[PDB]
Amino acid sequence: RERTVRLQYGSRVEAVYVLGTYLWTDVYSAAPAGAQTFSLKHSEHVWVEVVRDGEAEEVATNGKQRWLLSPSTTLRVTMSQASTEASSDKVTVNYYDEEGSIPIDQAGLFLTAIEISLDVDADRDGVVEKNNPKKASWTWGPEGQGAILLVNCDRETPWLPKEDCRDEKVYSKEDLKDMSQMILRTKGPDRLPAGYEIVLYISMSDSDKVGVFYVENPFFGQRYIHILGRRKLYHVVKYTGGSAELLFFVEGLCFPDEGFSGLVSIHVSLLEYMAQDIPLTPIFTDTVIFRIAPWIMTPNILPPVSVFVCCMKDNYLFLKEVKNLVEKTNCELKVCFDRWIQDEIEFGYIEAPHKGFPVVLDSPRPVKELLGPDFGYVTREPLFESVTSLDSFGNLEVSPPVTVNGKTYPLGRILIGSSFPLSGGRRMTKVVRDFLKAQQVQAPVELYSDWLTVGHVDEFMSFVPIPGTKKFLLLMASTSACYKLFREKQKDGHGEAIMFKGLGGMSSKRITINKILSNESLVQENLYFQRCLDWNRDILKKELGLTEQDIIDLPALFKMDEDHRARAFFPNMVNMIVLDKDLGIPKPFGPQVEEECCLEMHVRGLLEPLGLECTFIDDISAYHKFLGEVHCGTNVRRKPFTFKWWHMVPSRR
Amino acid sequence: RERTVRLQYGSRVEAVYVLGTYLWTDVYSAAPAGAQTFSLKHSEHVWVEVVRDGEAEEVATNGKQRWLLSPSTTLRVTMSQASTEASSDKVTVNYYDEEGSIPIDQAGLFLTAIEISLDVDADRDGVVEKNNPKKASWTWGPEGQGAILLVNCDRETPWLPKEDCRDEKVYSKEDLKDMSQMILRTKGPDRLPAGYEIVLYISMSDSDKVGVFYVENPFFGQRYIHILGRRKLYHVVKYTGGSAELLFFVEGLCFPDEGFSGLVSIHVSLLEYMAQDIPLTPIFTDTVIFRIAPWIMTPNILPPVSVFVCCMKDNYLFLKEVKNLVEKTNCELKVCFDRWIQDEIEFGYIEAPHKGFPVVLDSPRPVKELLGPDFGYVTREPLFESVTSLDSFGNLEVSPPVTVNGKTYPLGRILIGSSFPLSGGRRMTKVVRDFLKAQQVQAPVELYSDWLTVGHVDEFMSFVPIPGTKKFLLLMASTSACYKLFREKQKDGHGEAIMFKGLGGMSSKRITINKILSNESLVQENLYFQRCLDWNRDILKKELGLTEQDIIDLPALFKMDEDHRARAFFPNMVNMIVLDKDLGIPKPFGPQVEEECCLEMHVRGLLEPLGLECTFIDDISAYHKFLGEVHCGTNVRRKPFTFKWWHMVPSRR
Ligand SMILES: [Ca+2]
Ligand SMILES: [Ca+2]
Ligand SMILES: [Ca+2]
Ligand SMILES: [Ca+2]
Ligand SMILES: [Ca+2]
Ligand SMILES: [Ca+2]
Ligand SMILES: [Ca+2]
Ligand SMILES: [Ca+2]
Ligand SMILES: [Ca+2]
Ligand SMILES: [Ca+2]
Secondary structure, X not given: OEEEOOOOOOOOEEEEEEEOEEEEEOOOOOOOOOOOEEEEEEXXXXXXXXXXXXXXXXXXXXXXOOEEOOOOEEEEEEOOOOOOOOOOEEEEEEEEOOOOOOOOEXXXXXXXXXXXXXEEOOOOOOOOOOOOOOOOOOOOOOOOOOEEEOEOOOOOOOOOOOOHHHOOOOOOHHHHHHOEEEEEEEEEOOOXXXXXXXXXXXXXXXXXXXXXXXXXXXXXXXXXXXXXXXXXXXXXXXXXXXXXXXXXXXXXXXXXXXXXXXXXXXXXXXXEOOOOOOOOEEEEEEEEXXXXXOOEEOOOOOOEEEEEEEOOOOOHHHHHHHHHHHHOOOOEEEEEOOOHXXXXXXXXXXXXXXXXXXXXXXXXXXXXXXXXXXXXXXXXOOOOOOOOHHHOHHHEEEOOOEEEOOEEEOOOOEEEEEOOOOOOOOOOOHHHHHHHHHHOOOOOEEEEOOOEOOOOHHHHEEEEEOOOOOOEEEEEEEHHHHHHHHHHHHHHHHOOOEOOXXXXXXXXXXXXXXXXXXXXXXXXXXXXXXXXXXXXXXXXHHHHOOOHHHEEEEEOOXXXXXXXXXXXXXXXXXXXXXXXXXXXXEOOOOOEEOOEEHHHHHHHHHHHHHOOEEEEEOOOHXXXXXXXXXXXXXXXXXXXXXXXXXXXXXXXX | XXXXXOOOOOOOEEEXXXXXXXEEEOOOOOOOOOOOEEEEEEOOOOEEXXXXXXXXXXEXXXXXXXXXXXXXXXXXEEOOOOOOOOOOEEEEEEEEOOOOOOOOEXXXXXXXXXXXEEEXXXXXXXXXXXXXXXXXOOOOOOOOOOEEEOEOOOOOOOXXXXXXXXXXXXXXXXXXXXXXXXXXXXXXXXXXXXXXXXXXXXXXXXXXXXXXXXXXXXXXXXXXXXXXXXXXXXXXXXXXXXXXXXXXXXXXXXXXXXXXXXXXXXXXXXXXXXXXXXXXXXXXXXXXXXXXXXXXXXXXXXXXXXXXXXXXXXXXXXXXXXXXXXXXXXXXXXXXXXXXXXXXXXXXXXXXXXXXXXXXXXOOOOHHHHOEOOEEEEEOOOOOOOOOHHHOHHHEEEOOOEXXXXXXXXXXXXXXXEOOOOOOOOXXXXXXXXXXXXXXXXXXXXXXXXXXXXXXXXXHEEEXXXXXXXXXXXXXXXXXXXXXXXXXXXXXXXXXXXXXXXXXXXXXXXXXXXXXXXXHHHHHHHHHHHHHHHHXXXXXXXXXXXXXXXXXXXXXXXXXXXXXXXXXXXXXXXXXXXXXXXXXEEOOOOOEEOOEEHHHHHHHHHHHHHOOEEEEEOOOHHHOOOOOOOOOEEEEEEOOOOOOHHHOOOXXX
């Protein structure tokens, strides 16, 4: 970077020189009227070239050389090392007229060289490198560069309710581990020359996106000073001489969203005082950029850590069977004593090179009670738009990693249920949809859920890993599979086999295979629901790059309501607890053939040959009947993807 | 694209098949309970494969072949040509049990094949190609693809005041020339089968970005129907059989801006009627994308077309000299009988493959009086923020094409004046800055203008082409050049030479070179203003990739006000009319030496050796004095760049 510093007619000029720049210096304006030629002297650590109309010539410290004065003959002045107290760094120009070789006048330039660099870990190894030349840009991908910031959304200490980033203070040194390091490195003499100061600053716009803290160690112990952030746009830095570093810690306050890309900047400037009432001049400016890490969802193929479960204290069979299932794994079981754990919360995560942790997304209105150390919280509230069932997180899921027409989605794709564009039907609120879209790395896809009364994608589809492989299956609810099976069992002489055996509140209904198959209107309803399922099958195959070989159909059956929307006739088996090879599957209570549920046997016949182990989990017996509603919920918290999100190259927005 | 169509237990299935897709067909669900095997027949134009667990086998129209029934054995059904009235397109499946070779049941699929494609000129040659496979995406660059739309911001007929795009109507067929063509191409039999319709639609969000018209030729002459746009989100298409095309014309309503990227979509869907009260199902959907062309500014290196001039009717010298200047060129002179033509308007342009024209940007509050056929209008109004002098378009300029550290800016870079970040000074309103940024192709740079009372970049800098070359110069105001020259003339014995000769209202002041050079406070002020100029010089060199060889300094002098801001002491010569090699330069009224202005002679000495021809234009004599204000204005409307904006690859936002 070239910077203009002119000699001044009369008075000598004193300037600060920042390493990594160089000066172009006008010696002509300072020359007396009528002067002919000039000569120069300079000190040891100042490098000086005379540039005549673009041609540069190096000049000795004391020579006698003279050059013709001319507006096109200038100096280029460079310094490679910072000044110390032992420095006299200078360039002196002598002027001569046509008569005589004794100078008629002299113009000086006195320099103080300093190093100033604002440094971040741009190369994303967790350590802060010295002046990464790419630190002011942010690029995606394996070869990409620029520093990353976490939203510091967890809570270090229980005493205050809110997440850490909601204020301007740091209570605990543990909080600093969530933060990105930024070091202002300087080198120079004991003090800056008169009239200069160093200032860190941010834009008003970014002031609600970041906060920046400096650690002091005064007498009575460590304290944390907020130097940039909400209602603080600048901080005047205390300069220390010699080779010095100031360590700062940066937190993100806000996730990427509609209208916020995730990029924020921090600057340092060397400012020069001109006079009272006159703004200070920015002599040198150095900039670093951060990208705030997105919120990321975990598909069922990822290793389970904890199984969160909600039910009533007396649903014993459910608790017993879920415990049994989880005991086959290394997972923790966590129980809260009615669908809220699945509908109100989605467990995501955030990651930066230095740190990562899980973050709960809270569905629009006690889930804030999960907020804790390295367990974060984020939520979106529609300001205007009304919330519907499609805003519940049973309607929010994510695919395994997929490749679609050569385009890779290494983190998978978020899936949310919706209605047809011209339908006037329900849709997840714009505020949540915009949030998910803005995270960018999961490239969300809308499916069609609005044919269901509750309207959730988890009612009709799920994903399971195929054991012993890198692959997965899409599981789809299928009414056609159910009718085929029931018609077979009828043909086999089982038409009088009864559903819901053991649920005493259903006994008077005496629902058999015969009764189901004879119900003409129910047949028509389910043919229509199969059309709805197949529409989704097609969009899933398209948007996930799946073929028929990747799909298994589980028997399902629905009843239609007044809105022509579906609710489960018997428990939906597709919405299952997936812990690697072990599947908790809702117990269907299907027709008993030879004292086994034919639905259970059919499902085992589909899954078991693939190495999947099926456990049927009864959540309804405690209620004595099934009306289409599930009274329990589960949510599995999983390990994050191995693939780092910053290695993705998302499509241009 | 694969689509799911199942045979139905009992009743035959009738379906529409859209060319370019294919069907995967379940024959198992339709099979009677206990059936063992199936066989199939199909018609001539239906291609059928039996797919067993992923392995596909082509099947003849009438064979006798049987396959084992199985959920994993399915049909793949393809058609290469649309149905006509002579078509019976079908596939029929026969089912068999273990005993006997006579079918026990049959399930049919009756097909009607149609072609549906919504086509646009994606390859950007001005003609609408058939189904460009990239039509649903928009990519930048020489190899880029996707269709382009103009904001139709001009006005075809004078009767209504507003720009064409402000309503839902088209009065004149000339308007269609500004619009992009979109053709819905179909092929099929006399009518769609019962229960289907074709519908064009857009999102609510895009409904204020576009409008779409169809031309009818009824008995009494041509009429224009608005089928999509404001408050119309969909249009049901009238289907014509055989091979048919419907031609539509698309206009943009809105420029890219903060919160609008410029991309809009239009869809067509084939919809299936399910029943009353049930949404129609989107059987097939085809999509095209448009990008709305940005507003682009023209630098001084571009060929002049028209010179717009505003002054009082009696400023005769100004009018005479401007006419003389323009007569040396092929330009039109347009005169309006006080700075408004430069401050209130910036002449830009828009371009699409089919059409382009000039578009005026109107500065925030009779410039709307320029609105006319192929002369467009756009403006931005701050809703809240107050307008200052920095919002005037003397503060809005653009560089010639430049390359900066290997990054090319083939359209140049917009330049707007501002204040230092921490200064609390003036800045152009966010609404205009956001607009300029959103055009993206000119990558705006803020300079420092707030040291000037009026605060406009055109007070201190301009660009001129270097005749006979592909190159250009940056011209900078320089106080140091002025002091050097005046000190030389003083030394030469000219100190008593007077400024402002011939301006009678200044005579009593008797301003000479001596009086100027002796004024100590004025010297200090101008040293400070030179610091301000040099700060800009540095940012221009950095952001435009310029060296000292690319810059010429014109003598200038300023007086300071109470805010420590500069106003011109004598007319600013840098703000000049550039018509190729011919430069109208404000007449400075400098000290006369040998009956010529020494400022004029000095400027000629700088410019003339480069082949630039200088004409000094006197706009102040009619006012008898110069107070720092200019009473005339000029604005040159130029030809657009040869380089097409869509060939640029702007940085990711
Ligand atoms: Ca590093
Ligand atoms: Ca805090
Ligand atoms: Ca924390
Ligand atoms: Ca923490
Ligand atoms: Ca969920
Ligand atoms: Ca074309
Ligand atoms: Ca119109
Ligand atoms: Ca028009
Ligand atoms: Ca027109
Ligand atoms: Ca302008």
